Amino acid sequence: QPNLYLSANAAAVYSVENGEALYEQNADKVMPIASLSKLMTAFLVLEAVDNNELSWDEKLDLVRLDDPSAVSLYAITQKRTWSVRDLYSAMLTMSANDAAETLGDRLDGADFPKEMNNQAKKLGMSSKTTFVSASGLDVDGKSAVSTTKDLFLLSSKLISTHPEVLETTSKPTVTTDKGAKLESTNDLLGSIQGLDGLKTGFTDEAGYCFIGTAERGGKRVISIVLDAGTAEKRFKDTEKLMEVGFK
């Protein structure tokens, strides 16, 4: 494998076709993942719509977060009622934590972390993965953790099961029906040709994290960057991983 000099502590890029690694650094090491948890929440929201168990047009009131300081749709808008569609978009574009928690609570109430971990097992993720909340916020001091290998398995399963997820994560801005603008945290959209996802994350413990995905000519790759040093460097790391991915 090539000799990359990444900011990330743990990183890898995989070809979706055979699931095989084109670069791996610390790909078995258990890492905090933070807002990357929202990809499991998206999967379960998309499953519930397909199962005739949830409506895109259902109106829900945002749940209140124990810390009013965290990134939240409510603080940006002063608007409490939102459709499932817009909460889903907010979760994936700007990483609104209260959107993610409102969706998880609607799906399974208090038991939603159990459902995330049940589904982690069904998707082939190892027992090193632990989800604690729909948003990736710590609960009872407990943090969501995984590995780049398990994160790949979740990502590729999300994309092959619900390809329409990329219709949301490929957009630099999502405008809801009523005109609210939801700006994506993925600053590489429009910079790498073929890049259409997937999810950012950051906490002090997790560092700056990003799962990316791009397809050129039938070939899809998924890159995972964990614990980069700055908000810009997880993207510079991704640029290097995409270059290896399409070599």
Ligand SMILES: *C(=O)[C@@H](NC(=O)/C(=N/OC)c1ccco1)[C@@H]1NC(C(=O)O)=C(C)CS1
């Ligand atoms: C997901 O990781 C989420 N992070 C936080 O809400 C958060 N938690 O700290 C305990 C935090 C602290 C400082 C900034 O966020 C979203 N992560 C990011 C990002 O990927 O950079 C943004 C832009 C929205 S919050």
